[PDB]
């Protein structure tokens, strides 16, 4: 949890999520556009379901120091991103780190710092019932 590199290594990587609704493709959270208005097409959306999740494959194991989430901003539904974990997984898809968050507290973004963790996947997992996961962008930075 000290300095991080400036390059967003999640941009343009393979992304996936638990389901897709309202056209909100998982790749919208790694398209290099943090615009949080759903109508501008750069925010993801899963079904309303239990324990929705979204993941990016960094494509190799990297030493991750920071993951920045940008929430949806339009429609007074920003609170759907609450009671969730940010998880780092190794190449074998085992958990190597996990942090839980109750809220973003109305902030547009959350910066999550990891202590130099070697991981290939970054996952956001909701812990709530019957709630869709929408992210405008997830950016990931290596430890410096
Ligand atoms: C009609 C269509 O093509 N899609 C609508 C959704 O409307 C589109 O996307 C919205 C976010 C706006 O950009 C809207 O102008 C656009 O037509 C529609 O979403 C609701 O749309 C109303 C306006 O009609 C409000 O914007 C509302 O906040 C939207 O609902 C929210 O966003 C959705 C994507 C879901 O997450 C809802 O649960 C939210 O409450 C959806 C609305 O059900 O229906 C499509 O037909
Ligand atoms: Ca985006
Ligand atoms: Mg507009
Ligand atoms: Mg893959």
Numbering used by the authors: 41 to 184
Provide text from the study.
While LLY shares a number of characteristics typical of CDCs, it has a unique 162 amino acid N-terminal domain. Glycan array experiments revealed that LLY was highly selective for the difucosylated glycans Lewis y (Ley) and Lewis b (Leb) antigens. In the work presented here a Y62H mutation was designed and constructed with the aim of removing the hydrogen bond between the N-acetylglucosamine (GlcNAc) of Leb and LLYlec and instead, gain a hydrogen bond with Ley.
A third metal ion binding site is observed in the mutant structure and we have tentatively identified it as a Mg2+ ion binding site due to the very high concentrations of this ion in the crystallization buffer. This water molecule is shifted by 1.4 Å toward the NE2 of His62 in the mutant structure, compared to wild-type, to optimize its interaction with the His side-chain. The B-factor of Ley is 53.5 Å2 in the mutant (overall B-factor of protein is 29 Å2), compared to 38.2 Å2 in the wild-type protein (overall B-factor of protein complex is 21 Å2). In the LLYlecY62H-Ley complex, there was no additional bond formation between the Lewis antigen and His62, only a shift of a water molecule toward the His, as compared to its position relative to Tyr62 in the wild-type. The mutation causes an overall 2.5-fold decrease in the lectin domain’s affinity for Ley and doubles its affinity for Leb over the wild-type domain.
